[PDB]
Design a protein around this nucleic acid. Structure first.
Lengths: 167, 161
RNA sequence: AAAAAA
């Protein structure tokens, strides 16, 4: 049950790229983002509508478009970690791409991966930042997408068990 | 004691904004960044020359400029080495993870989580000051936003020499 | 490579 969890910001192209971090692909892809109006799923909709065997979901941190202070962040992080526990599969650690968002978003998903576990945590760098699916496919033919593996995390079984408190 | 650990990328000005996360500032400032040319230490050197009783240092990941591979077989180990030697020995440091590519911010978060931090935080600036008086203008007009992301107790990894 | 993948 290959599950990719992705943070997104205002560059939705990190998620189709993340999907190609492994040649097999992913059975599930779940994205967490702010609900800023700058967030755009159009490229995400068309891409995954073209992969009908992929369970795809967008989850927003309701009401928070920009993290600017402590309260914002603790709300973001609470809703993120609930999302992580909910979407991570039961008999297998998830794959997590922390590329999208402001730095606090990437760091909070890194910390969640360290707590609950992840088969791999990675980041994607693109020579020319593909703006579209077709330029992404161009870029990975030329080898201009670079996947940075930053480590397996076992997590803690007692922290995964927090999934029991959730609906 | 009262030690700020800061990751830097190609925007050195996150560091003096970080210094102003508290009115008292910090008694030491320690920066870690890659070895690329687009890192400019000059605004940092000029700033901290004006604060002589702050101990300031810059440490680069010698040999590594960009990180493109598995955290390029190198960044994380130097970062964690640097954190332990720079951190206070009987108190936890303050940590600003603002600068760098996402992987270097994420790696400092992880170091904070393992070794402990009094505070982990991030800094947003409306207009991205490029120099000190732009930052002091932004500070005056509420244009710099400090995001406190949380205390980290860390482990007994601190005990490492 | 701080308000959002190098």
């Amino acid at each position: 049950s290959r599950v990719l969890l992705c943070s997104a910001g205002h560059s939705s192209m990190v998620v189709p790229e993340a999907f190609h971090a492994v040649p097999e692909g992913f059975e599930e892809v779940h994205v967490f983002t702010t609900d800023s109006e700058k967030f755009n799923p159009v490229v995400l909709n068309d891409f995954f509508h073209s992969l009908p065997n992929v369970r795809f979901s967008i989850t927003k941190c309701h009401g928070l478009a920009d993290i600017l202070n402590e309260r914002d962040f603790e709300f973001y992080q609470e809703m993120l970690w609930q999302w992580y526990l909910t979407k991570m599969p039961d008999n297998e650690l998830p794959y997590v791409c922390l590329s999208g968002g402001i730095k606090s978003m990437s760091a909070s998903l890194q910390k969640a991966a360290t707590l609950f576990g992840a088969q791999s945590v990675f980041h994607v760098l693109a020579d020319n930042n593909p703006r579209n699916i077709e330029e992404m496919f161009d870029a990975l033919q030329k080898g201009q997408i670079h996947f940075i593996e930053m480590g397996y995390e076992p997590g803690w079984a007692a922290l995964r068990r927090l999934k029991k408190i959730l609906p």
